[PDB]
Ligand binder design. Structure first.
Ligand SMILES: Cc1cc2nc3c(=O)[nH]c(=O)nc-3n(C[C@H](O)[C@H](O)[C@H](O)COP(=O)(O)OP(=O)(O)OC[C@H]3O[C@@H](n4cnc5c(N)ncnc54)[C@H](O)[C@@H]3O)c2cc1C
Ligand SMILES: [NH3+]C[C@H](O)c1ccc(O)c(O)c1
Length: 440
């Protein structure tokens, strides 16, 4: 009689948590599959992550599931020591991956600058705005100003040259999965805080270790623990929510009474649902604006075995492209992240060739694939990233929804928010605990 909307990681881990506490639940999932924005799918000859890919043991929630479902030693590092290429002022520069990492390390020093003052506990991201805050008033003022500054402007204002600016532009096109110039720099500062304020650790956590058996080894693991069947192909159309109960209506018109609703539908898809009473205005403002997640992820297959890394600034079709798999038919599969889903067809060989042509003339695309999450009505976004102002007046507003309507999902997590499965596992579990505590 707790209704969980969505069978992504947040909904699945919430259901398992309620099951432990002996609370009845049902998961309603719009699609014919579980996993949500994590999706391991056979494409181009091997299982590919169409959404979530990388993990690390410094991600508490993800790592606990990894060792729980038998994947402790089933991780492999992405290719390193690639030949690096970056576009600066319309020109392609060649260098080593070490050259590029060294430039990004210098830029991150400035990008992280106030993280030690803001985030002594990196899992208390709004401590500076708390009544417990005991630092100088100027730290609070800089904190609020940093929510209105993008991460590239920090590097420009520090006097870095155009080559570094173009590299950081490319880097945050990928990191903010859209337009980095509309983003909040506090997101980047918290990533630093969660990564011991070191670029190499941040990259080790977010872009290095892949699951050999895919994200599906974790979400199928959680689903396999559930004693209540998930209702697939059952989109929720309406949520009524009050002080002591709730009512969910599906698109087919079926009405389901509930003691509480845990809604894991992302902001990009919340407009599909009618809420009664209406969601708070501050929450509605975030839904209208959306997150700063408008980009896309591609998998490109080229002829030959090539150790390749490419960076290119906005408005490139793809801003970061890296070799990931070397296939037996003498081809390489590369992964790419781009800032604008509408400027690339992830399944067009000509478009993928244009991506590769950003850096090389000689490499030939023979296949390409991807899922455009932004054009997917049940997602409407890639991973959640913050526009200006959304660090302090965005993700945290979804907590109180007065009633028995709780929002859970990676996009509302305290820690690795939006960008990581860790945040979905965090917030699905803690939201289930809110429901557990209320009932106890
Ligand atoms: C391209 C991409 C790459 C990523 N790479 C990584 C990575 O390398 N590492 C990492 O840790 N994380 C990565 N992530 C992040 C990770 O995928 C997310 O943080 C996490 O999967 C989100 O889980 P969630 O449960 O919060 O939401 P979701 O997975 O979005 O789950 C919500 C569910 O609700 C369903 N739903 C929507 N509307 C309705 C409705 N009306 N009725 C019923 N059901 C509905 C959806 O179909 C979905 O199943 C990536 C994300 C993307 C988009
Ligand atoms: N899935 C994308 C992943 O979160 C990512 C990709 C490129 C980055 O520069 C990054 O910080 C994160």
């Amino acid at each position: 009689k707790v209704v969980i909307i969505g069978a992504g990681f947040a909904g699945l881990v919430a259901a398992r948590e309620l099951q432990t506490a002996g609370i009845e639940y049902e998961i309603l999932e719009a699609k014919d599959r579980i996993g949500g924005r994590a999706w391991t799918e056979e494409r181009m000859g091997r299982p590919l992550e169409l959404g979530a890919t990388w993990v690390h043991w410094f991600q508490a929630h993800t790592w606990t599931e990894i060792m729980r479902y038998g994947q402790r030693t089933e991780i492999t590092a992405s290719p390193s020591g690639n030949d690096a290429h970056w576009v600066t002022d319309g020109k392609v520069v060649k260098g080593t991956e070490d050259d590029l990492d060294e430039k990004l390390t210098a830029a991150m020093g400035v990008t992280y600058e106030g993280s030690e003052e803001y985030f002594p506990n990196p899992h208390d991201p709004l401590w500076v705005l708390s009544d417990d805050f005991d630092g100088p008033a100027e730290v609070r003022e800089r904190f609020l100003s940093d929510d209105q500054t993008n991460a590239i402007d920090l590097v420009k204002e520090a006097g870095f040259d155009q080559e570094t600016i173009d590299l950081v532009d490319a880097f945050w096109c990928a990191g903010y999965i859209g337009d980095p110039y509309t983003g909040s720099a506090l997101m980047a500062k918290q990533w630093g805080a969660l990564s011991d304020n070191r670029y190499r650790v941040m990259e080790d956590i977010t872009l290095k270790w892949k699951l050999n058996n895919g994200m599906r080894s974790l979400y199928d693991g959680i689903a396999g623990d559930l004693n209540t069947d998930i209702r697939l192909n059952t989109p929720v159309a309406k949520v009524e929510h009050h002080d002591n109960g709730a009512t969910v209506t599906t698109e087919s018109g079926e009405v389901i009474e509930a003691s509480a609703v845990i809604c894991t539908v992302p902001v990009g898809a919340l407009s599909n649902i009618e809420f009664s009473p209406a969601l708070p205005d501050a929450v509605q403002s975030v839904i209208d604006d959306k997150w700063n997640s408008q980009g896309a992820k591609i998998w490109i297959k080229i002829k030959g075995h090539h150790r390749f890394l490419g960076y290119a600034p906005k408005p490139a079709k793809m801003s970061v492209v890296r070799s990931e798999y070397f296939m037996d038919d003498d081809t390489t599969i590369l992964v790419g992240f781009g800032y604008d889903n509408t400027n690339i067809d992830l399944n067009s060989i000509e478009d993928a060739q244009a991506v590769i042509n950003q850096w090389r003339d000689d490499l030939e695309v023979v296949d390409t694939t991807g899922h455009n999450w932004v054009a997917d009505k049940w997602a409407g976004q890639a991973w959640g990233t913050l526009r200006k102002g959304q660090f302090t007046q965005g993700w945290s507003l979804f907590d109180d929804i007065d009633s028995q309507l709780f929002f859970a999902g990676s996009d509302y997590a305290y820690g690795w928010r939006g960008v990581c499965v860790d945040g979905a596992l965090e917030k699905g579990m803690t939201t289930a605990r809110q429901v557990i505590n209320s009932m106890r």
